Amino acid sequence: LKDLDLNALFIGDKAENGQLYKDLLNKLVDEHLGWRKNSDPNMIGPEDQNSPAFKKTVGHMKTVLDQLSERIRTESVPWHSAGRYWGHMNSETLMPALLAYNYAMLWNGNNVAYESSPATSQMEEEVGQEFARLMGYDYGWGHIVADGSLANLEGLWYARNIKSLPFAMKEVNPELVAGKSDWELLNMPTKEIMDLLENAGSQIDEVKKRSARSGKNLQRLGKWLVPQTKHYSWMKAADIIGIGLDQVVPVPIDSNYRMDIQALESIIRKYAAEKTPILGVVGVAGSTEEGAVDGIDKIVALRQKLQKEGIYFYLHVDAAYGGYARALFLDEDDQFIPYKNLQKVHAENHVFTEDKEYIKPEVYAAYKAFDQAESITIDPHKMGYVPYSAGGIVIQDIRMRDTISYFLLGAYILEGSKAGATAASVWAAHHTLPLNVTGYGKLEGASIEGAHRYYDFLKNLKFEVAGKRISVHPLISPDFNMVDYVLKEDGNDDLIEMNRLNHAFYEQASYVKGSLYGKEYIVSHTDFAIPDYGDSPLAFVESLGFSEVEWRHAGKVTIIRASVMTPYMNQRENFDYFAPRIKKAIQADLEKVYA
Amino acid sequence: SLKDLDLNALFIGDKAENGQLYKDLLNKLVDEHLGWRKNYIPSDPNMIGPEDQNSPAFKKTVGHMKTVLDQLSERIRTESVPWHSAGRYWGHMNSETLMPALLAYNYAMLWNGNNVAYESSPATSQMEEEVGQEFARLMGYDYGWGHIVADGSLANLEGLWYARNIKSLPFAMKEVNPELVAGKSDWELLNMPTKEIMDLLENAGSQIDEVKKRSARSGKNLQRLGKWLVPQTKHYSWMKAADIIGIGLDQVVPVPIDSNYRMDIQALESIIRKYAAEKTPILGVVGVAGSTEEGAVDGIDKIVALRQKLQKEGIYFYLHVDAAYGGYARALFLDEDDQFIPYKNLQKVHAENHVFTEDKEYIKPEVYAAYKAFDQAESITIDPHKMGYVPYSAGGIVIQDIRMRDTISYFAGADIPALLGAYILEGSKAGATAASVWAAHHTLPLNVTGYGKLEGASIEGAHRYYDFLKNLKFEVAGKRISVHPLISPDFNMVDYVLKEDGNDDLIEMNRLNHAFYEQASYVKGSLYGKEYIVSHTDFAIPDYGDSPLAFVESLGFSEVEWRHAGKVTIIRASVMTPYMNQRENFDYFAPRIKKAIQADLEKVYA
Numbered sequence A: 001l002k003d004l005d006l007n008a009l010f011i012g013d014k015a016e017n018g019q020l021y022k023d024l025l026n027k028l029v030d031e032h033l034g035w036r037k038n039s040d041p042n043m044i045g046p047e048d049q050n051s052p053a054f055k056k057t058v059g060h061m062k063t064v065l066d067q068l069s070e071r072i073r074t075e076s077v078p079w080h081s082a083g084r085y086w087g088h089m090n091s092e093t094l095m096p097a098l099l100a101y102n103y104a105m106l107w108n109g110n111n112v113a114y115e116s117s118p119a120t121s122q123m124e125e126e127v128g129q130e131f132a133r134l135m136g137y138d139y140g141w142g143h144i145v146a147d148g149s150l151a152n153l154e155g156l157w158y159a160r161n162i163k164s165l166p167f168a169m170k171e172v173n174p175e176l177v178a179g180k181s182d183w184e185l186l187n188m189p190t191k192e193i194m195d196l197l198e199n200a201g202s203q204i205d206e207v208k209k210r211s212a213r214s215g216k217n218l219q220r221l222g223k224w225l226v227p228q229t230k231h232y233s234w235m236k237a238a239d240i241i242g243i244g245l246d247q248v249v250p251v252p253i254d255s256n257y258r259m260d261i262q263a264l265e266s267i268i269r270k271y272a273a274e275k276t277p278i279l280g281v282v283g284v285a286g287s288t289e290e291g292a293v294d295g296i297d298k299i300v301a302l303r304q305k306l307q308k309e310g311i312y313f314y315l316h317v318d319a320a321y322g323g324y325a326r327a328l329f330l331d332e333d334d335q336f337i338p339y340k341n342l343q344k345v346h347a348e349n350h351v352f353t354e355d356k357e358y359i360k361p362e363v364y365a366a367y368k369a370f371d372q373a374e375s376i377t378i379d380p381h382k383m384g385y386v387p388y389s390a391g392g393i394v395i396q397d398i399r400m401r402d403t404i405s406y407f408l409l410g411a412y413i414l415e416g417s418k419a420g421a422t423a424a425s426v427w428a429a430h431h432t433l434p435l436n437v438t439g440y441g442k443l444e445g446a447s448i449e450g451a452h453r454y455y456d457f458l459k460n461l462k463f464e465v466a467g468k469r470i471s472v473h474p475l476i477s478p479d480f481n482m483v484d485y486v487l488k489e490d491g492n493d494d495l496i497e498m499n500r501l502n503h504a505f506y507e508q509a510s511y512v513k514g515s516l517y518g519k520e521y522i523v524s525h526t527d528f529a530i531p532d533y534g535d536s537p538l539a540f541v542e543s544l545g546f547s548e549v550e551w552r553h554a555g556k557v558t559i560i561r562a563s564v565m566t567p568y569m570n571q572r573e574n575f576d577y578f579a580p581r582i583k584k585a586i587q588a589d590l591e592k593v594y595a
Numbered sequence B: 001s002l003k004d005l006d007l008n009a010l011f012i013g014d015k016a017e018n019g020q021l022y023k024d025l026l027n028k029l030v031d032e033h034l035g036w037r038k039n040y041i042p043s044d045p046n047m048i049g050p051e052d053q054n055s056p057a058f059k060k061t062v063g064h065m066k067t068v069l070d071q072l073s074e075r076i077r078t079e080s081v082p083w084h085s086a087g088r089y090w091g092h093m094n095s096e097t098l099m100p101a102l103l104a105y106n107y108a109m110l111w112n113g114n115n116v117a118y119e120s121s122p123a124t125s126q127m128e129e130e131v132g133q134e135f136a137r138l139m140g141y142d143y144g145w146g147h148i149v150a151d152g153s154l155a156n157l158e159g160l161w162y163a164r165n166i167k168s169l170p171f172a173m174k175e176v177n178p179e180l181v182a183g184k185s186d187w188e189l190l191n192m193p194t195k196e197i198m199d200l201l202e203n204a205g206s207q208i209d210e211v212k213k214r215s216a217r218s219g220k221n222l223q224r225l226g227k228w229l230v231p232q233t234k235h236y237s238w239m240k241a242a243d244i245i246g247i248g249l250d251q252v253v254p255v256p257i258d259s260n261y262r263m264d265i266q267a268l269e270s271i272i273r274k275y276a277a278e279k280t281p282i283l284g285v286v287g288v289a290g291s292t293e294e295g296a297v298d299g300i301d302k303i304v305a306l307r308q309k310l311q312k313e314g315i316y317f318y319l320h321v322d323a324a325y326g327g328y329a330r331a332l333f334l335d336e337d338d339q340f341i342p343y344k345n346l347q348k349v350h351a352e353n354h355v356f357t358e359d360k361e362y363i364k365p366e367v368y369a370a371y372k373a374f375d376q377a378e379s380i381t382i383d384p385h386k387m388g389y390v391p392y393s394a395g396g397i398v399i400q401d402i403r404m405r406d407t408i409s410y411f412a413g414a415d416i417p418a419l420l421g422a423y424i425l426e427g428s429k430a431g432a433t434a435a436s437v438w439a440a441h442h443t444l445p446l447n448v449t450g451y452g453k454l455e456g457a458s459i460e461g462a463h464r465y466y467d468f469l470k471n472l473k474f475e476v477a478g479k480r481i482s483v484h485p486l487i488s489p490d491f492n493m494v495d496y497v498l499k500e501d502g503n504d505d506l507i508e509m510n511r512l513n514h515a516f517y518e519q520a521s522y523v524k525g526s527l528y529g530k531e532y533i534v535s536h537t538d539f540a541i542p543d544y545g546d547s548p549l550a551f552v553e554s555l556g557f558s559e560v561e562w563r564h565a566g567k568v569t570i571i572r573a574s575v576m577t578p579y580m581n582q583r584e585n586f587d588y589f590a591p592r593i594k595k596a597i598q599a600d601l602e603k604v605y606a
């Protein structure tokens, strides 16, 4: 697939490939309709179709769809326009994923029961194998979940039930764990748990009855450690799963907005000295507001270190946003690419348009260590470009599914009924674009390169407006494809005024419901506030000349946010066209803020 | 209002009779979306041009995409179960969905909005809010709310998350501010009616956040919250729900069902009293409206009356109605202004709105009484993708009082949430799913003018099937074989057994019905159309207790036989098609079904 052309796989910002989409859709719908036809005799005949009541019912249906159409066309946000839109959301999806959904949903199969939908059931089995291969799990498994928040919950459900198994085994058959103290039982590695459970053989059902599934001993299972900026799905997941919000422990992040691994170790050692177990740790690959990648490799090394002293924790990687990026690192046979060969393999497969370093070494090392996590959340509906709703969960060892199972897919998942059409959509996206450099690598690469062009363009911007001098100050070089920055009046050390400036700028560079005048530059915004960030933004705000005192008084810094998900800005010629226009739009927006 | 609505026009059709209408409307919708991307906000220039489209690499990539779609297309067509044809298919699944629901999904998916945050997709967010208001009005809630859930198992989990959190709130208030609940013993605090808990919480005012912090959200006090009582045949989503939500499997208590396969309310009361006498609370009770294998409708009215009785003795329990299957059937009892129809006006209103083609009694009085009492439940599960005829995947949950949502909410008057995602159990959710349900509900209002007709047509078809089965006799290989319907249907599921006359071996009757099922079913790769297709299931003692004893005894089996076999195999039908309500249509298939049953029995015995 060396010459795979991404331009052919999307409808396009201006529906440039609309006719292709229509042609393929009509062909697939014809195939379904032919299939229903190809017996007797017609429940609905030409006598029915011609009646006055039938035609009036058709008219009624058409009126409701016209009302639907009106609302969606006039209340939706203007469609994203590459080169102008530098905000946090993307709605564009892979055309083969849209088509496959459109076709499959005509069968209306339900993937909880193989019977109702054998082909999409098999497609979900294949997608789960494809996730496991992406993450480097030789004996793993995965499935499609309604969304990544529920995948996170499923992750905690595994961790919770797994932690509780050693004691459950002791209750059912003390010889399975003979000689182990309670602190050893609370610090058994997950592989050793699954090997014991396998040895328990026929007693697995009784063992499961005495596990956390029984509701007993939940608080004993210990602390769930997350970065302080965790997505709120994690707080909900601890609430829902019964360990509770009291057991969630925030771990400080560093100046790169990554979980501070020295602080992680200090927290873990302090709980372990009290004999409080660590239920698990969440590492994030692709944070929600900075696209930061945590040092998953540093967490795995820390765990190996602590295992020597009798301490173990479950590791879950929340890669809801960053999951598909592991495709950058896998060759056409799905093998992990050595770091020194990376630029060469990328150049050969046209992942990046220029041959330079694009991936930070510590980002590479973090992604390399995924295969050591017990479980991973990944969302086709984010950076997989599959339409909502489609989340995903990957587990390291397929035997883990027996810890949550009920008495095939339906027996092994948190949720109930699910659309076979969803599996068709994800399956079609994966087979059009393999999960390595030949497929998704190119798509994730185009996004990263457009984020780098944008980042490079923003670091040298100054504006003269209403007698004042304003500079752009990028937050950090992006780990992935999110780029953040602040505007600031030169020499002005009032953080509250800087906050007000970025907020007002955002209001000038954003649409409102009903907007029809196109804007040349659209951004997003968010606040980094002390309650979720602590002092992680302090070095940045001090670098700008604000004092620590000023930080505590304002209590937050307002940040202009961009998640670069369009593939079109990777090309120098495309980006260069918009760069001078963006600069003119920022200048006019500042004129309006100060007027 | 909509008196002449013709249901035939709202489906693609078993033989794709309306396939061209579907394709025409789909193509109009797609052109409207494509014209919107191009022109709603005119811009220059195009990122993809004719010089890109005509390059060899582009054409080759199109070729590769067509190959993948051709592969998908083949696998689904060659592996799928043959499409179900009304009059031939009498089994437990339906795949036919409303055409406006399908078209609306197809169209809205092109924008790909996410309904977790309003700002992201305001039109579909507004549609989901209106759908929630529609669910509330359907269930008779004066100030309730609802929303679409990924599926009905997760809606039941959400139900339990509400009951768990609400139960824990009076203790959390005690812990944060003892004056709020001064003078109430612990047993009182664990038996406060939900509305009284919500009023106290509103009074907590500025301390609400601290109180939620100390509630079951914290992970503290879960085991003090009490038992979750469900009918013995519960959908497994409940055992699973208890495990997930942290109260544990050990807190689920099965309540015996009666000979109608409804929860036995005398046994419910006895269990509750038992627990109360030892000061164990009841976390809540699940009433099923439309059981999975019999379509039975539990006496929700009798549960409500019991709870009013027990409240005089200081006992309260949360009530959740699982109407995953039977939720939309409430539209049978609502007039065009959405008011509940009195029972004695029901046949008249149904005749005026053409809900049933013959003027007879279809709705049992105890079924009417049960649906009327839905508005007294704290929460209700309802699945648009079952009897709503909306495509998978779309579940629903309705809550009796909008204020309840503040007990489970997060922030990261009762107007539309800015982050729906903060009032719900799940996370990201397709705006296309809200569009699809919205379009269904506006094409077919949730009352006699709309869904009443569709739920009615299903019910009337189930009754025709029931009446046909009731006196069916066959002569095969010298033996005399009768059909024995389980019970007259509460809703639209119809169950029966075949039995050799005079033979008392329940094991043999079981083996007859299994073999019959194997003859009247498809296998993967079936191309010969069958005249008759059925489903089957076992009523086994672990799940059913002695509920089927009266029935098997009415056939001539002994209690001892029952215990030896430990189960009775049942032939099952969920009559979901709308086409069998008409006499004409059904009468055409009746002799053909009878012929097919005779031929199937001949093969069984050969």
Ligand SMILES: *Cc1c(COP(=O)(O)O)cnc(C)c1O
Pocket (backbone or CB within 6 Å): A147, A148, A149, A150, A152, A231, A233, A284, A286, A287, A288, A318, A320, A321, A379, A391, B116, B426, B427, B428
């Ligand atoms: C968006 C997101 C989630 C939740 O995923 P949904 O699919 O939106 O439910 C979890 N974690 C992170 C890091 C995310 O960005």
Ligand SMILES: *Cc1c(COP(=O)(O)O)cnc(C)c1O
Pocket (backbone or CB within 6 Å): A415, A416, A417, B151, B152, B153, B154, B156, B235, B237, B288, B290, B291, B292, B322, B323, B324, B325, B383, B395
């Ligand atoms: C099917 C069903 C459920 C589960 O709903 P799904 O949408 O299939 O997850 C719950 N309760 C009852 C009574 C059911 O029939």
